[model samples]
Target: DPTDCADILLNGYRSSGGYRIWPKSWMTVGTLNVYCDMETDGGGWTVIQRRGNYGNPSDYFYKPWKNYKLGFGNIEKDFWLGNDRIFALTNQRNYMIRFDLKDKENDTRYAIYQDFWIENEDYLYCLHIGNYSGDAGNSFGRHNGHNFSTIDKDHDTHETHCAQTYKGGWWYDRCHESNLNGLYLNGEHNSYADGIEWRAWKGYHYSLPQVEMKIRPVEF
Candidate 1:
């Protein structure tokens, strides 16, 4: 599915049935030219950049482990479990697919588009109580969109690209909407007044925060 993209992003991943590797340093350094259309046809990972660092990321299987948003660990940036793109520990990225909406989720293309200190929400979400990136904090974004949006922080907010359950309504994608607030709440409603508070008032519904997605890094 479109989840677990964090995992596939961490060390590597297999998209559309093709194998692709993470960028060098497991981060970005100027939008390292990738020689493939990783959007949906995710496959054939070949770094065409002059320099790259394909590192193998491993940590608590990339779940609640990477929730080190409290400036403790490098989970937000180093690991893929969390969308290092918008929700970051110390980085910034661009080149996101159409889903990232405001270009936040899985925004980490390991491609240097611009430039963080994990501010999504005191970077507390990095703590990992149950899921949530296993995390959020007032952070930067792929762009300077809204006035009170995640992407405006220069650090795009994020949405769990893995086995996440934000729950919008009865089988809905509201509460779990992108950090920009869509799948769960209103598309214009991100970074709620009380962070996830909107999640509690998605109206009488069942909440459909059930997404099963993952990307695997293949070995040749």
Candidate 2:
């Protein structure tokens, strides 16, 4: 199996742009330079640059890039995954090859690219939720009184207008795109609750009117 080939472990890093290790490992046999030769019509094969030390930097290594056909069709070009996995495409067929740094003489190679949903709306939504927290408001701006600066001793017109509009209108009722909107409402309610909590604990007088906010859980 491709995963079992220790020799192919280093191929991923080599197929990528290549990197310098601060402390080299003994398991490193040598470096493999990968190249692809593509035709004008978009088709090619990838050839390994037989250069560098297979078990250490040596003069006998073959630098395929110097004199060889590194065929890679008109695909998106080779890319490395964490300096361990390499992915290439030729004629619409994706190839996942492993590179090993040990036992250069018996390096293992294989193709293991499976079909997956690359552009699904549900997948995109899940990805967004996974990377961000809607309740935290970290990715968005929250209305606060700090917008008013004492420099001019004047209220910020933009912020003042926004505050007035938000207070007077039913902005939450205008849209219902997804359950995510409910999360925003819950966050707003939590913010108000937090203010009250602080005032109660610190004995600070807060005159702002308390409003009700809704909350619900999202399955995904």
Candidate 3:
């Protein structure tokens, strides 16, 4: 079986890049099923988190530690690709992460980190990232080197629970600069820092309507 989405693109049969074929909806990596973003940054990206106009419950992202650990939702729609799977995949080799974002105006942008990885569960899957390059600004850089926190598990550095206050699991410091896993809100709203927010692009109160987080091996 292939190791990940990149493995599928590298090893599976496909039409020549000279000819090109549209990306498939899904692909298998080991025993796990994952969405393959075969058209972004380089054509081997594996989607780790996705939230968009593809409607789900407003509280879908407000999951518990175990839910976030094992993952939930349809791979073709909104979903988190599971923390354990991400940890295992990133540990296999060095990887680069990409964040694809869109505002309420439908304006699209992206941010990429040359290096990305996470610690195992014992460390609350602390996030580690390095060297950013993209039009979306360095929003994720603030949360880099922080541990993941969920509504049930207060692993963040803040005195008050960032996860509980913000309403989703993330690697928050005092809070966050980017919260793709936040409550799926509609259009523009301001009050709480709670929303599918990317502070650099849309500000803290405006909840983004579309977002994607994907990864690929650096040497691939």
Candidate 4:
């Protein structure tokens, strides 16, 4: 009697470990995209369509429409959210992948450019394009005063601090330079001298720079 739903059994078992099979029309396969919606009771999420295998029509699977929700998984080491996209890191690849729930099949994917530092919800950051040396203009880090430069110096104060923490203190000098360059000086010269008084400082000062960047999802 259940033979009519053979397709459901095949797809469901392959995608998820379950016995019961839902209707064929109710199933979707491929990749499941997730997004961060902080507005929902500490933030919620929405999912897109399912992803199927490459070049294999018969081997394709469907996404569990009902089971799709915003939550952390054990294997999912890291979670990132940016521009309505969800990024996840798995222990297997030590890699991060981005999924756009807007159009599951057509969603873009990106690998974790470098190792992720902050894995908490309160603070989220990611390094793009493997500039672990902290050279990239876009390194992700917390906005707190601890790891950023308040002084006008360089554009990568926050990222430099992150590199210092994970990679070591060997790059402290560079980090300091980045902080300074981000503030009073641009590249080698100051844009304006009006606030020059605020430029002078003795020790390292940290400040959160106002820039647009994506943030990783909160770990539960």
| Model 3: per-residue Cα lDDT over 104-165, one tens digit each | 77789999997798988998999999899999989999998899999899988888999988
Q: Candidate 4: worst 10 consecutive residues by lDDT?
A: 194-203
Instruction: Report the number of the highest-lDDT candidate.
Output: 3
What lDDT tens digits, residue by residue, belong to model 2 across residues 1-220? Answer: 1121122332342232222221122143223333332221121223221212123221111112111112221112222111111211111222222111112233322111112101121221111112222221221112111221112122234423322222211111111111110111211243222111112111212212211111111210
lDDT of 2 at 154: 22
Report clashes for each candidate as comma-separated counts: 52, 25, 0, 27
lDDT of each: 0.25, 0.20, 0.82, 0.22
Off by over 4 Å in 4: 1-112, 119-173, 176-210, 215-220
Q: Which stretches of candidate 1 lie over 4 Å from their true place?
A: 1-22, 26-80, 83-94, 100-206, 209-220
- TM-score for each candidate, following the candidate numbering: 0.24, 0.15, 0.90, 0.19
| TM-score winner between candidates 1 and 2 | 1
Q: Candidate 4 on 1-220: residue-level lDDT in tens?
A: 1111123233332232122222222223223333222232222222211222223222111111111113222112122122112223221123221222111233221211233222222222222222222222222222222321112222244444433222211112234322211222111232222110111121123221111112222231
Output the better candidate (2/3) by lDDT. Answer: 3
For TM-score, the strongest prediction is 3
Give all candidate RMSDs, comma-separated. Answer: 15.0, 24.4, 4.9, 18.6
Ten residues in sequence with the least summed lDDT for candidate 1? 127-136
RMSD of 2: 24.4
User: Could you tell me how far off, in angstroms, the CA of residue 66 lies in candidate 2 after the best superposition?
Assistant: 4.8
